[PDB]
Structure 1
């Protein structure tokens, strides 16, 4: 729920937090945890390639089943869990044959539910079907691009992908950007919007909260020196320049997509 903090300190005055009572409170599933080390935005040459990444809390990776390949076996949704690696919550689900998995939690799914994957599965949230079997007009998530590859679209909290057409071997999906994309009809997709929509209503309230999530501060080019940024310099506050990225490319309006390989699949841009 969206609960506002009382202003007993200047940092806590503006804080809005999302508290979920349905989440598990114990330790997560040790067979399915893994380590990941933080990079600080540094690649194998050691240089900062992505700025403003570093620090934050230590995290463990949860192996999440995006393929949803164990088809034909009914599964009992056991519990909902906090995954620190993504916006959405995960669900520990127990299959009928004794093997446990982590999945994304769709909206409305609760503890002790029924889900099932495969071509013969029913049309209800949490169930995974190929989009040749999924009826048109229906909202899905965790959508694949290639058959058997794994889910890649509508994976953050509260997002969904709407199937608008089916023309032969391809279906047209309207994506949360507003984008119409043709994808193969053999690709899998799980019904229902992803949960944790209230995730967008959070207010961090302080720079400390940002640093806990692991983002270093951002310095404006107009505050830099001329040698550092194309915007830097001036006595007082001077700009007089067209807005560019630190490497010199214009940053307000200039389109940067160039992929003639997938221009054939893109039907309409996000406008």
Structure 2
């Protein structure tokens, strides 16, 4: 839960909030387990040659990525024992260290409502209905919450893997695939029942409550201060410049490039994923 701390600072006030991190987790100091960690580097919006591709990225602190299993099909039908819920500095979600019943450990996603010591299973057969279990979508009745859904069959959970993410079950299609799901984006997609996912909502739904409070906390995440479009030079980004603030220019102002950013439909219907759409959050299909 978010909370504030009286810092007694002599430089203004702050509305920053921090989560207690200990009525839900443990071990506030880095004490990980070896052979399951990969050091990750940040790019700061730069390309493979060092040229800018993304804006205002930088200042992030070093983070060691935890080796998570996303495909989860490497070893199935072996029951795992939940051993810990570890903070993941690489993502808004948290990782979970589980121990298999054969003598191995792994990292998985942490949904909300799980406990340390529980037992889970990832198989291609129907299994116990607990948040975390994964099975073919044809075996799951409607009315549940699912996350970490893959688009590639046996590809690995990519869609809906941030904190406080879920999907609403909207029935199944005749063809044995194209299960209808309402996603947390305003869209509604027909996925593949061959593709699997981890049921349950992702933990940390309170991510909408945390407050950065100051520019410093934001910079250390990896978000750099950036200038507004109006304050840009008449040549770098021609929405202003010179003495005195001026009203914005032509209708539907531009990005650093000539594109619109308020009402332009930037998705095209010339892909196979177009047939996978039911609701497009701007009408139908």
Specify if TM > 0.5. yes
1:132-162 per-position Cα deviation (integer Å, ceiling 9, x unaligned): 1111221111112121011122211011111
Larger relative strand fraction: 1
Matched, 1:249 2:259: yes
Matched, 1:103 2:108: yes
Greater alpha carbon shift after TM alignment, 256-265 vs 77-86: 256-265
With normalisation by structure 2, the TM-score equals 0.90
Which ranges of structure 1 fall in alignment gaps of 5 or more residues?
none
Choose which of 137, 140, 149 in structure 1 pairs with 2:143: 137
**How many residues are matched?**
271
1:163 is aligned to: 169
RMSD (Å) for aligned C-alpha atoms: 1.6
Which ranges of structure 2 fall in alignment gaps of 5 or more residues?
none
Counterpart contact for 1:141–1:153, Cα < 8 Å: yes
With normalisation by structure 1, the TM-score equals 0.95
CA distance 1:223–1:264, shift in 2 (3 Å): same
1:35 is aligned to: 39
What is the deviation of 1:259?
A: 4.3
CA distance 1:31–1:12, shift in 2 (3 Å): farther
CA distance 1:212–1:12, shift in 2 (3 Å): farther
1:236 is aligned to: 244
Counterpart contact for 1:231–1:241, Cα < 8 Å: yes
- Give the Cα separation in 2 of the matches to 1:62 and 1:250: 38
1:84-137 per-position Cα deviation (integer Å, ceiling 9, x unaligned): 110011110001011111111111111111111111321111101110111122
Matched, 1:264 2:266: no
CA distance 1:166–1:11, shift in 2 (3 Å): farther
Choose which of 46, 63, 77 in structure 1 pairs with 2:67: 63
1:174 is aligned to: 182
